[PDB]
Write a protein that binds this ligand. Structure first.
Ligand code: 5PA
Ligand code: 5PA
Lengths: 328, 322
């Protein structure tokens, strides 16, 4: 009942059936607690990820406007850009990507392989910038010049993280609650927290469907201080768009992303090696490896509410493995 | 259903209309998304591993042993499954093209092998794969492990049962939504081809199955597919009378080397549909499908189903060149 205003928003279908929610018996054995995983890395468009959920809503909205071009921004190895470009090609929309190099690498695989490779396959128009210092303004500058060519453009923010985009993860929460019914009583849910729409959609959904479940966002780019107001605004705007309130507090851990966004760290790469070796599951150096390292330290240091089951949201990211090898 | 099987896939994989590609080609083209199986970037081999690794467990094996190219998709999938189950994986690898290109050597599927803690054994050539795996199975057993051997591509009669299963999905998914005329799959180690051959003969007898070869001539390949076809049919107490159809014009200059038509097929599907093929298998098979339209080489000009057998992580190994 509580989330029924969701059907008011037009949406496309890119996924179809609920993504798998699987027990991780070997990781659970090693960690000493029940770990489950939500497999949003297996969404069926061009190597999947958390963004296909958001794009179902955003692109549906783009088409309502009669738009024929999608314009977004991110890192050279951004998964969002890649899923956006894939969806654009699929629909015969044009796509324009404002890309940056957030880490100052000159490594050829970072510059040319992985997610950046696939963008050329989708015929993405690539616009390089020194830095995404003001992505929203920079995207509007780009859309103006693109509009001048006669294109009918639609601006998708970094990570598709607007209140409309985040509706995909309100919907994920409905899936998750449905799959967990009578099978597992969850205590905690862990997801990486970057552009913030995934965290925020899940925050709203879980508050209304699974009140007593603790949602933990592991930051990938920012301190709790910088990040919390970003999640809160989406949460609040999302709630209002669904005619609900949201009084849940937002929870964030920021101890797992140093030296900074897009830079691999030891605990992240050890989490990647753990999931691969024990579960045959592929994480990534930027997002999920670092999120999972937070889950692990969280168990180690007893940072969760209790000792009960934890759901890790696999938000994708694997193609970046190939861009980060051998280094930088 | 008389064979023990492990659950690696679950729900039937999508079967989709490809409207933009259909528009461009002037033919109705559908796709079977076996690239979207949920284990370590998927592929056609997981269908086979459901039967093969179930068999391994029945024998109380603690180690999976298989063979392939450095960038073999099958090796990668076997290792992922091995990891997931707490089995050791030993892989026998060759460099089938003599490249020194770093991405082919260490990126793509070969990078994942290290993540899955795969024990890597290098060999000069897989000249007799069945024999060399058996020599390796002896060595590893001598160290105190209990190995189970999986052939190249897991293409035994038992493994190919995965693709008789796939046919069931296809048959259910295609009716009533279309009036299919032709099916196209890449034909390599022959497990995927022969399994679909048995299944489609019985389930959709009016459809033409075409295997585009990726490593051999029609003369070298046809007995391979026919033999598996007969072996599979026997173990299911069925008779398989149907012809095997093979086109071999689409893989020069050899296995694991990309060609222009294949890369143009990779580009075409990515740009028109947001679908990713690969330089070794599906790209070359799709090029075969496209040329069949220009040369009017299909039995009739009706709907075609392409079987996406996976392969995409190879893109990252093959870039920027080999
Ligand atoms: C695999 C993966 N996991 C988690 C996240 C974090 O999600 P949010 O951006 O919704 O907070 C991303 C985001 N990535 C960004 C991108 O540009 O790709 C949006 C920043 C992701 O790609
Ligand atoms: C993506 C992809 N597509 C098609 C095929 C051909 O299937 P068959 O081997 O069943 O004929 C492979 C094979 N795999 C090879 C490997 O070593 O990876 C020869 C097995 C494949 O990986």
């Amino acid at each position: 009942m509580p989330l029924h205003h969701l059907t008011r928003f037009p949406r496309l279908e890119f996924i179809g059936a609920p993504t798998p929610l699987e027990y991780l018996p070997r990781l659970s054995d090693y960690l000493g607690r029940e770990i489950y995983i939500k497999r949003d890395d297996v969404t069926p468009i061009a190597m999947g990820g958390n963004k296909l959920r958001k794009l179902e809503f955003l692109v549906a909205d783009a088409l309502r406007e009669g738009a024929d071009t999608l314009i977004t921004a991110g890192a050279i190895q951004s998964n969002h850009v890649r899923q956006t470009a894939a969806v654009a090609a699929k629909l015969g929309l044009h796509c324009v990507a404002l890309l940056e190099n957030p880490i100052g690498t000159t490594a050829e695989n970072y510059l040319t392989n992985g997610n950046r490779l696939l963008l050329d396959l989708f015929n993405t128009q690539i616009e390089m910038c020194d830095a995404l210092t003001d992505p929203d303004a920079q995207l509007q500058t780009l859309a103006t010049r693109i509009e001048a060519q006669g294109f009918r453009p639609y601006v998708i923010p970094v990570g598709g993280s607007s209140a409309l985009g985040a509706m995909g993860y309100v919907e994920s929460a409905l899936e998750i609650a449905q799959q967990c019914e009578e099978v597992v009583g969850l205590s905690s849910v862990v997801v990486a927290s970057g552009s913030a729409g995934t965290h925020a959609g899940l925050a709203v959904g879980l508050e209304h469907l699974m009140p007593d479940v603790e949602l933990i966002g592991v930051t990938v780019s920012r301190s709790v201080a910088e990040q919390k107001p970003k999640v809160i605004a989406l949460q609040q705007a999302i709630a209002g768009q669904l005619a609900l309130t949201a009084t849940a507090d937002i929870h964030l851990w920021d101890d797992y992303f140093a030296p900074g966004y897009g830079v691999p760290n030891d605990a992240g790469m050890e989490a990647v090696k753990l999931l691969a070796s024990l579960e045959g599951v592929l994480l990534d150096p930027v997002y999920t490896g670092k999120a999972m390292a937070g889950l692990i330290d969280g168990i180690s240091q007893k940072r969760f509410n209790d000792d009960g089951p934890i759901l890790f949201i696999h938000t994708g990211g694997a193609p970046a493995l190939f861009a980060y090898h051998p280094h930088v």
